[PDB]
Write a protein that binds this ligand. Structure first.
Ligand SMILES: CC(C)(COP(=O)(O)OP(=O)(O)OC[C@H]1O[C@@H](n2cnc3c(N)ncnc32)[C@H](O)[C@@H]1OP(=O)(O)O)[C@@H](O)C(=O)NCCC(=O)NCCS
Ligand SMILES: CC(C)(COP(=O)(O)OP(=O)(O)OC[C@H]1O[C@@H](n2cnc3c(N)ncnc32)[C@H](O)[C@@H]1OP(=O)(O)O)[C@@H](O)C(=O)NCCC(=O)NCCS
Ligand SMILES: CC(C)(COP(=O)(O)OP(=O)(O)OC[C@H]1O[C@@H](n2cnc3c(N)ncnc32)[C@H](O)[C@@H]1OP(=O)(O)O)[C@@H](O)C(=O)NCCC(=O)NCCS
Ligand SMILES: CC(C)(COP(=O)(O)OP(=O)(O)OC[C@H]1O[C@@H](n2cnc3c(N)ncnc32)[C@H](O)[C@@H]1OP(=O)(O)O)[C@@H](O)C(=O)NCCC(=O)NCCS
Ligand SMILES: NC(=[NH2+])NCCC[C@H](N)C(=O)O
Ligand SMILES: [Cl-]
Lengths: 284, 288
C-alpha cells in the first residue's frame, strides 16, 4: 500500500490556452472537461465545433502564434483565467511575454519548473525541481528553486516537506561545485525547514542506503522534494521515472502569479492531464 | 515481449584471476563468496585479517598484507606480473589504489583516459543499456567526453555489441550557448563522423524511446534504440544510475575501464547482486 497524489477532482477554475490547435493540445482538454476539472479559454486558429459546444469552453479566434500567446497572457493579467497553458506555439513565444514584468505574471521571484511523481516503487509522492527551466542554477537560484518547491509542498498539503539537495556524492569538495552549493543552501535555511545535502540519490530515497552510509536524518530515505544540481540531472531523473519506472507525473512552472502548464510534445495524455490537475490544486 | 539480457541466472564460470587490494570486511568479502559459489573465477586476497573458511577454497589465495599501501601495490604487481586479470578495489580508500594506477609509469594505464561505465538490464527496456560516466569523471568536457565515448565503444565491442548506437545525453535536442553540454554533445558527434552510430544532444526520451523521438519529429533510425548513453556530467550519470537501480528495478554491473585491465570499484551501497554483476562484467571484459 502507498499514498498517491493522483488518486481519484473538480473545479470552476479557468485555463487560458495559448494556441488551442492540434490534437496533441486538444486531447488533454477533452479529458479535463469530461472530468469537469475546469473551464477553458481557447485562443486558436481553427475551431473545433464539437469541442466549442461544451458550455465550459470559450473560443477566441487567433490566427498567429503571437496573438494566441498575447491573448492568453492578457486573459491572465485581466484575471479572467487562473492558469496559463502553452498550446501549439513555441515555448519561447509564450515565455517572452510571461517574463515581461509589465504583463503582471513575473514578480521578484525566480520561476522554476517542478514535477510531482507517483512512482510505483516509492512509498509517497515525490517532487523534483528544476527539470526543464533553470539551466545551471547556482546557490542563489537553488535557494529560490527551493522556496518555490516549499510553497508548492505547502499549497498541496505536505506540511513539513523533507528536502534533499541532490548530487553524486555526500562529501563537500571543490572538485564538485554542486556539493558546495548544496551545503550553502542547507546553511541558508538552518532550522527553518527540513533540508539535507548534498545527498546522492540512493541516500535521499532509501533509508537503508542512508543508514549504510551512517546517515539518519529525515530527508534521507524520506525525501518529499529533490533539488536537482543542474538541468541535465533533473531532466534525466524526470524522464527516467516516466520511461523506466512507470511513474505518473504532473508538471508546472511556478513562481509566477499563476501556474503555467508547459508540456512536452510527447508527454502522455494521462501525464498531460496530471499537469492540469496539479495546476488546479495550486490555485486552491 | 522479447528482451535481450546481459546477465544470466545460470552461473557463468571462468578461471580468470581477481587481485583484491584490501581483502577485509563483509562489504568486500560477500561478493567474493558469491563469485566462488558460482565458480566465477579465482582470487588473490591481499588483506590483514584472514577468513580461514573462505581461504580453504582452492580458487583462493591469501596474501597477508597489513597496510592499504602494501595491499594496493601487491594487487597491482600481481597484474603487472600477469598473475591477475582483473583488479578489485577492496577495503581501502579509492585514492590509495588509484593514485598508483593513474600514474602511467606503473604499467597499468596508457594515455587513454579512465572512466567508469555501467551496464544495465532494465525490466522495461528491451536490451542492455550502457551508461557512462556515472562515478569517476566529474565534469568532462569535449576531449574527455570523446575519450569516455571511446572507452564505451571498446567496452561495447568486447561484450558483443558490434554497432553500438551512442546518444550524448542532455536536457534538450536543440544546441544552445545557454546549455554548454549541448554544444559539447554536438562536438563529440562531429568528432566521430560516420565511423559510428552516434547522436546528440538528446534528452533521455529521444534516446531510449522511438515513439518519443518521432513525436519530437526526430526520425533517425538511431533514435529510441540507444545502446550507450554518455552523461553530460557526473551528477546526471550518477542520478540516472541510481534511478534505474532504486526505481526501475535494474540489475547493473560497473567497472572502471580505459586501463590495461578492468577495475572493480563498487559503492558501499551497491547490492551484493550488483557487486557480483560487476565481477561478471569484468570477466566479460577480459574474455579472449
Ligand atoms: O532565459 P535566458 O535565455 O537565460 O535569458 P532571457 O533573455 O531569455 O531572459 C529574459 C529575462 O527573463 C529573466 N529570466 C530568465 N530566467 C528566469 C527565471 N527562471 N525566472 C524569472 N526570470 C527569468 C532574465 O533575467 C531576464 O530578465 P531581465 O531581462 O529583466 O533582466
Ligand atoms: O520545443 P519548444 O517548446 O517549441 O521550444 P524549444 O525548441 O526551445 O525546446 C523546449 C523544450 O523544452 C521545453 N521547455 C522549454 N522551456 C520550458 C519551461 N520553462 N518549462 C518546462 N518546459 C520547457 C519545451 O516544452 C520543449 O519540450 P519538448 O521538447 O519536450 O516538447
Ligand atoms: O584524481 P585527481 O584529483 O584528478 O588528481 P590526482 O591527485 O589523483 O592525480 C592523478 C593523476 O591522474 C590523472 N587523472 C585524474 N583523473 C583521471 C582519469 N579519469 N583518467 C586518467 N587520468 C586521470 C590526474 O590528472 C593526475 O595526473 P597528474 O599527476 O599528471 O597531474
Ligand atoms: O576519495 P576516496 O576517499 O579515496 O574515496 P572513498 O573510497 O573513500 O569513497 C568514495 C566513494 O565514491 C566512490 N569512488 C571514488 N572514486 C571512484 C572511481 N574512480 N570510480 C568509481 N567510484 C569511485 C567510492 O567507491 C565511494 O563510493 P561510496 O561512497 O558509494 O561507497
Ligand atoms: N560504480 C558504482 N558503484 N557506483 C555507485 C556509487 C555512486 C557514487 N560513487 C556515490 O557515492 O554516490
Ligand atoms: Cl504509484
Amino acid at each position: 500500500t502507498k499514498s498517491r497524489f493522483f488518486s481519484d477532482e473538480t473545479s470552476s477554475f479557468v485555463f487560458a490556452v495559448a494556441g488551442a490547435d492540434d490534437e496533441v493540445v486538444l486531447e488533454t482538454i477533452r479529458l479535463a472537461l469530461k472530468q469537469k476539472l475546469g473551464k477553458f479559454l481557447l485562443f486558436g486558429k481553427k475551431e473545433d465545433k464539437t469541442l466549442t459546444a461544451n458550455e465550459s469552453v470559450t473560443w477566441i479566434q487567433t490566427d498567429t502564434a503571437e496573438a494566441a500567446a498575447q491573448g492568453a497572457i492578457l486573459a491572465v493579467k485581466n484575471k479572467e483565467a487562473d492558469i496559463l497553458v502553452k498550446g501549439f506555439i513555441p515555448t519561447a513565444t509564450l515565455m517572452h511575454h510571461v517574463l515581461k514584468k509589465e504583463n503582471g505574471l513575473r514578480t521578484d521571484q525566480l520561476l522554476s519548473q517542478i514535477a510531482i511523481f507517483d512512482i510505483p516503487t516509492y512509498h509517497k509522492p515525490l517532487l523534483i525541481t528544476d527539470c526543464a527551466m533553470n539551466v545551471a542554477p547556482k546557490t542563489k537560484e537553488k535557494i529560490a528553486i527551493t522556496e518555490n518547491a516549499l510553497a508548492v509542498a505547502h499549497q498541496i498539503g505536505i506540511t513539513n516537506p523533507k528536502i534533499a539537495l541532490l548530487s553524486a556524492v555526500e562529501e563537500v569538495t571543490a572538485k564538485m561545485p554542486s556539493t558546495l552549493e548544496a551545503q550553502e543552501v542547507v546553511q541558508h535555511f538552518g532550522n527553518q525547514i527540513s533540508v539535507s545535502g548534498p545527498l546522492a540519490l540512493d541516500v535521499a530515497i532509501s533509508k537503508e542506503a542512508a543508514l549504510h552510509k551512517g546517515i539518519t536524518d529525515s530527508s534521507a530515505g524520506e525525501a518529499d522534494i529533490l533539488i536537482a544540481p543542474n538541468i541535465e540531472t533533473g531532466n534525466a531523473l524526470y524522464k527516467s521515472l516516466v520511461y523506466f519506472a512507470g511513474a505518473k507525473v504532473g508538471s508546472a512552472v511556478v513562481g509566477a502569479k499563476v501556474p503555467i502548464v508547459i508540456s512536452s510534445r510527447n508527454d502522455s495524455p494521462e501525464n498531460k492531464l496530471a499537469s492540469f490537475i496539479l495546476t488546479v490544486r495550486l490555485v486552491e
